[PDB]
Each structure stands twice: as structure tokens, then as C-alpha cells.
């Protein structure tokens, strides 16, 4: 319905969305609130049926399959600490749908 925030550790944040199938164009954006400022980490646009992704930033690693699409940031460090929002947009066909999850705070430390 909306994006699924995931976290990998023992250091990655992962948005997971299941496309309706009708939708042929999908954009997953990852933003971050830290120090009184919200910021785009990265975005990626997915052509369903062509199973092809277009990453708007090099920092992230987008991946596509038949139904489900995935956008990942890896190697998070102390300064990457902040609130992480998954955003999901159904571009084409209409209707346009937007799903913004409540953020999931990430705290990182490096001994």
C-alpha cells in the first residue's frame, strides 16, 4: 500500500514497495530530517515490465523485479544519523498516488 522501511546491521536503510501491476512508472525517494532541515538522500524511477531503474544519485543502489522494487543506502556512518522517510509515487498511468511513511530514526556509532 505504502513503502516498507527496513534496516540491515550487526549498516543500510532500505525502502521496499510492492507495485499494483497496473502502474508502469514508479519513483521511490529517500529523504532525511537532521539538524532542523529535511534533505533528499536519493531518488530512483522504475519502469515496470521493462524491469529497468534510473538512479538520480550515485550514493544509493536501486533494484527492480517483476512486482516489487527496492532502493538502498549502504555504509551509514555517525553523521548519517537522522530521521529516514520512505516516499512512494505512482507516476503512470493515472491516478497519481503518493505514500509518505512516518520516519524511522537511525542512530550510528563507530568504535
Amino acid at each position: 500500500h505504502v513503502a516498507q522501511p527496513a534496516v540491515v546491521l550487526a549498516a543500510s536503510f532500505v525502502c521496499e514497495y510492492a507495485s499494483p501491476g497496473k502502474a508502469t512508472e514508479v519513483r521511490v525517494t529517500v529523504l532525511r530530517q537532521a539538524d532542523s532541515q529535511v534533505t533528499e538522500v536519493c531518488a530512483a524511477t522504475y519502469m515496470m515490465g521493462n524491469e529497468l531503474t534510473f538512479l538520480d544519485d550515485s550514493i544509493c543502489t536501486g533494484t527492480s523485479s517483476g512486482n516489487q522494487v527496492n532502493l538502498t543506502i549502504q555504509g551509514l556512518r555517525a553523521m548519517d544519523t537522522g530521521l529516514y522517510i520512505c516516499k512512494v509515487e505512482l507516476m503512470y498511468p493515472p491516478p497519481y498516488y503518493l505514500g509518505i511513511g512516518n520516519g524511522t530514526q537511525i542512530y550510528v556509532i563507530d568504535p
Partner: nanobody
Amino acid sequence: QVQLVESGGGLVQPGGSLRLSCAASGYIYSAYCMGWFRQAPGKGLEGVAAIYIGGGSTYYADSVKGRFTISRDNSKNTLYLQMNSLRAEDTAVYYCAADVIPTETCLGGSWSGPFGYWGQGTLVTVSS
């Protein structure tokens, strides 16, 4: 998933005052940025004001800064626009808008876009 419904728009005399209510029907929070837009009779969609919900930070269009003010109270979960000293150039259809977007672009005065959640609109006629 968020819904928006504007209200308070209507007939007013030029030089008058009016405040528009936008009742958000979802979960807004810190990361969200909410704003007001207007569509002039002939001209397309213009951004009048925006807020970074999290911060106090606000943006205002050159035409309306010092006359228009934009307000929010988490308690009610509703965005407000106070329009003070109206004009023949203010008369338009005022649309409520909300989206989680970079702060620099939210307050940058270039927000615009067809993306984000939008209200049904409310008609504001002010003239004669």
C-alpha cells in the same frame, strides 16, 4: 495517504481582510512542508507562501510578503493563511498543498510541481 479541504474563501471588498482554513485529514509531522498556491483568472498556478512544519521557517512571494501570513497548529491539524489588505491581483482560486520535500526547495520559492497532496481549492473573489 493525506486529504485536504480548503474553506473561508468568498466575496470581500478590495483593501479588506480574510483568513483561509485547510483541514488536513491524515498524519502530518516535522519532515512535512505545507504551503498555499493560487490560480489567477488567466495566469497558471503561483506559490504565495510555504512552511517547514518542523521548523518555524516560512517563505512568502514578493507580491504578498508583509500583508499575507501563513499559520499551523498541530492540535487542530489544520493549515491557515491570513490575507490582510486584499487587492484586484490577489483574486484567485487558492489551493492547499503538503509534501515531504527538501527544505531549501520547500522555502526556496520554486516549490511549484504537480506532485504532493493538494486540496479541492477555495474561490476568493475580491474587486469593486
